[PDB]
């Protein structure tokens with residue numbers, strides 16, 4: 001007796017919060033954090049949809065989503081460590097040399 | 101009065117407009133990643149608002 | 156059922172009393188008694204290996220609880236999955252990714 | 258069941274809002290771990306027991322451990338992050354917050370016009386998930402192994418020290 | 420659904436590419452050998468390409484609740500495999516100058532090709548999502564393969580962050596679609612709606628968020644700003660793969676999704692896609708007017724050509740030759756982009772270190788590299804859609820499909836964008852012949868690949884009937 005709309009609304013709120021954190025933060029680490037919030041919110045939306053329909057497909061899509069989240073976190077933190085090694089800062093606005 | 105071929109310049113007007121529009125559109129390619137994310141979210145808002153308007 | 160709601164209440168009381176006991180221990184410790192380097196990338200590599208192999212572990216966790224229902228076809232699929240896992244592990248060991256000492 | 262759902266959802270929302278506005282990286286990661294535990298509670302309230310277990314095991318137990326690890330390696334003392342507080346300036350966040358609010362209103366308006374008989378909360382076990390995983394979703398499992406292999410190779414190639 | 424031996428025969432290029440991934444991985448574990456591992460990768464890709472024949476004689480079937488193998492999937496599998504083989508061929512002479520490990524490049528290329536094959540066969544939201552990320556993450560590695568170079572690291576970071584954001588958008592849209600529909604197969608997206616109620620708001624919002632993710636993946640306006648930076652910063656064989664295989668595979672799965680989904684017949688989705696296609700054509704052509712960099716120019720070119728492809732996609736539910744137009748256009752675009760990016764890769768190879776710039780300087784190329792200059796001017800004329808080139812046959816197909824479906828705004832957009840493209844493509848082609856102030860068989864193999872692409876572009880430009888017959892032979896399930 002939990003409405004499907006309430007779970008989808010919670011997932012949407014978390015998604016837009018993660019996207020806001022991705023946009024407003026100059027740090028690459030907080031950008032990766034916001035990306036993790038976004039993908040976890042989308043996976044929660046899939047879980048809510050699967051639980052409404054009584055199917056394992058929502059949890060299977062959750063499993064694929066968190067596999068993607070783990071591998072993307074790995075690659076993003078590797079690139080962040082490379083950036084910190086070769087520039088000694090995590091300012092994403094400084095990484096802007098290609099333009100026009 | 102006609103020695104500069106005014107009709108030729110009138111037909112060259114679209115090329116000038118195309119160059120100006122291309123220069124104006126190249127301002128969005130400033131190379132900033134946060135602006136690219138912001139433009140993605142702007143496009144998401146525009147697409148979703150258009151879909152709810154035309155439904 | 157009465158048994159499941161009793162067990163839910165017992166589990167809730169267990170968590171509450173455990174957290175409260177540790178909190179009260181800290182509070183009593185505070186209240187009583189008078190008063191008066193750069194980390195190498197191998198740490199990241201090991202934690203990253205743990206994350207990746209933990210996700211492959213979750214796939215095997217889901218397989219292990221339903222082995223009899225999946226049959227021999229599920230065994231073949233999990234054998235392919237585990238062979239890919241072990242090939243990745245062999246690749247990691249042979250290239251010196253998992254060697255702490257150089 | 259619903260009461261746990263609303264409290265866990267509220268805790269997740271508040272913790273995520275604390276995450277995206279915080280200056281300390283370790284505190285932000287701690288609030289993120291709290292939000293992930295709350296989302297796991299949401300999963301358990303909806304009957305997705307395997308999803309909640311993996312939410313704590315993998316998301317709050319592996320990925321956040323990797324984030325915390327990297328933050329220790331950087332030794333982030335808030336250098337030119339805490340000393341500026343650019344995201345706290347209203348002229349910086351007033352635009353993206355309005356954009357996110359507009360997108361949230363559009364998504365919520367789309368959500369509220371859907372059929373909803375309610376979520377029964379009947380527990381869908383890990384056994385049924387594993388039956389579906391190695392039945393109708395076999396190629397998903399094998400190509401997800403390939404995806405994790407690709408992530409491993411990429412992160413090893415980039416994140417070496419020499 | 421279970422898997423039969425006939426289903427295993429339909430699985431043949433996926434199985435062969437995955438086996439090649441495992442075999443190349445174990446060969447790298449045995450001993451690091453650049454030549455042997457590159458040879459094993461190209462042998463596996465060629466084996467998948469020739470196993471497409473056995474796939475064809477297996478017939479069209481449904482292999483999973485997730486995959487469907489038919490002539491459509493065969494054509495896109497062949498295109499993805501050709502792009503991957505060409506990427507490996509261009510990658511070897513570039514990696515000859517690479518100081519660090521070179522063998523992981525081919526592993527990432529093989530995994531991305533596996534993702535392209537999965538997207539070719541994808542009949543499901545799960546397989547579409549998995550194929551997109553199986554393409555994207557090896558491209559995170561490949562775009563930043565020379566991470567010591569500053570531009571490659573910049574392109575890698577931008578591509579990784581923006582592709583993770585688009586993946587989150589796509590997955591949230593898929594979740595909303597699944598909440599509306601209750602099934603993740605393509606044919607069931609909108610099947611629970613009747614009596615003119617196809618425009619359900621939650622289904623439309625979900626498809627809009629998937630449109631955001633896929634339009635990032637297809638460099639479509641307004642999710643296009645990453646394209647010149649990532650195309651410029653990536654290594655040139657990676658730019659070749661990113662221009663050809665990723666775009667082709669994602670457009671093929673989008674073609675199949677909009678063919679099979681009943682909500683693909685929605686008017687609002689059609690108008691939104693028409694707006695995106697119009698803006699993509701005009702913006703991509705306008706933004707390449709003043710580019711002195713060949714890589715950024717080719718990125719804006721990719722935006723325009725994907726706009727033309729989207730115009731062909733919009734008329735899918737109305738016309739009958741829309742997917743045949745898409746196949747012909749994608750074959751021509753693949754060969755033209757292979758030639759152009761391969762000439763760029765050959766002139767950028769070997770990799771001359773991270774501290775030395777990889778600037779092209781195409782001016783006066785004919786006076787030291789005449790064959791490469793001829794190939795590149797053939798590709799510039801082909802990308803402009805000039806007759807006697809296959810790009811014109813693709814543009815003709817797009818225009819015929821647009822005229823058939825009375826999409827007059829898109830037709831005018833194609834004409835105007837073609838004129839603007841004519842300007843900048845001819846500028847590059849004539850700059851090749853002005854005046855400005857190798858030695859191994861793998862470089863010669865790359866030159867052979869770009870020369871064969873130029874010959875194919877010319878020959879199918881004057882005689883396109885074999886390609887048309889092949890594309891019409893690749894009929895998906897109705």
Ligand SMILES: CCCCCCCCCCCCCCCCCC(=O)OC[C@H](COP(=O)(O)OCCN)OC(=O)CCCCCCCCCCCCCCCCC
Nearest residue numbers: 159162163164166167168170171174290291294301306380
């Ligand atoms: C310092 C404190 C930090 C925070 C600590 C935790 C905060 C909350 C504390 C109060 C908890 C109140 C009670 C919660 C519900 C307990 C009962 C329960 O979980 O029932 C649901 C389900 C029952 O399963 P069952 O009934 O067998 O299924 C068949 C169908 N009836 O059972 C399940 O679904 C079981 C799985 C959920 C169990 C959750 C247990 C707590 C998890 C968080 C641990 C945090 C550890 C400390 C911090 C670590 C660092 C951050």
Ligand SMILES: CCCCCCCCCCCCCCCCCC(=O)OC[C@H](COP(=O)(O)OCCN)OC(=O)CCCCCCCCCCCCCCCCC
Nearest residue numbers: 163258260261264265268291294295297298301302303378
């Ligand atoms: C009290 C006011 C707030 C106080 C501050 C916050 C404290 C923690 C509150 C959140 C966690 C506890 C929520 C209350 C749970 C109480 C038990 C309950 O409601 O059980 C119902 C249900 C049992 O399962 P089911 O079979 O559906 O039951 C129907 C009956 N047949 O249960 C379920 O299905 C799932 C049970 C809940 C999920 C497990 C526990 C999740 C813990 C999340 C912690 C998040 C981090 C908190 C950090 C706090 C500090 C910042």
Ligand SMILES: CCCCCCCCCCCCCCCCCC(=O)OC[C@H](COP(=O)(O)OCCN)OC(=O)CCCCCCCCCCCCCCCCC
Nearest residue numbers: 434435436438439442446452454455458459462463466467
């Ligand atoms: C278990 C199920 C089935 C698995 C698949 C079938 C078995 C796969 C076996 C793979 C074997 C890999 C190792 C091969 C070692 C070859 C050694 C050799 O002769 O090397 C010579 C040369 C080395 O390089 P170079 O620098 O030229 O050396 C100069 C010094 N003489 O190197 C060369 O000149 C290149 C020689 C290439 C030789 C192999 C060619 C065939 C490869 C077949 C497998 C490829 C993938 C197949 C995919 C499925 C197809 C259905």
Ligand SMILES: CCCCCCCCCCCCCCCCCC(=O)OC[C@H](COP(=O)(O)OCCN)OC(=O)CCCCCCCCCCCCCCCCC
Nearest residue numbers: 111112113114115116118119708834835836838839840842
């Ligand atoms: C009867 C009228 C109705 C039917 C019309 C049918 C179309 C065919 C007949 C009209 C053709 C008009 C073409 C006008 C532009 C000709 C091209 C040109 O002038 O190119 C040269 C110019 C570059 O030279 P320059 O000025 O030195 O540039 C300095 C920059 N560094 O290049 C540039 O500056 C950039 C050129 C960009 C591309 C050309 C402009 C395209 C505009 C749309 C073309 C399609 C026609 C649409 C209708 C237009 C209005 C009639």
Ligand SMILES: CCCCCCCCCCCCCCCCCCCC
Nearest residue numbers: 093132134135138145352353355356
């Ligand atoms: C150094 C680079 C910094 C880039 C910051 C980019 C910030 C973009 C903010 C966009 C704000 C949009 C506000 C809402 C506009 C109206 C609603 C959307 C269109 C209908």
Ligand SMILES: CCCCCCCCCCCCCCCCCCCC
Nearest residue numbers: 793794796797800805806807808852
């Ligand atoms: C329209 C289809 C393509 C037509 C052929 C385009 C050109 C292909 C290359 C042919 C060889 C070019 C040789 C050019 C020599 C120029 C010498 C200039 C001296 C001032």
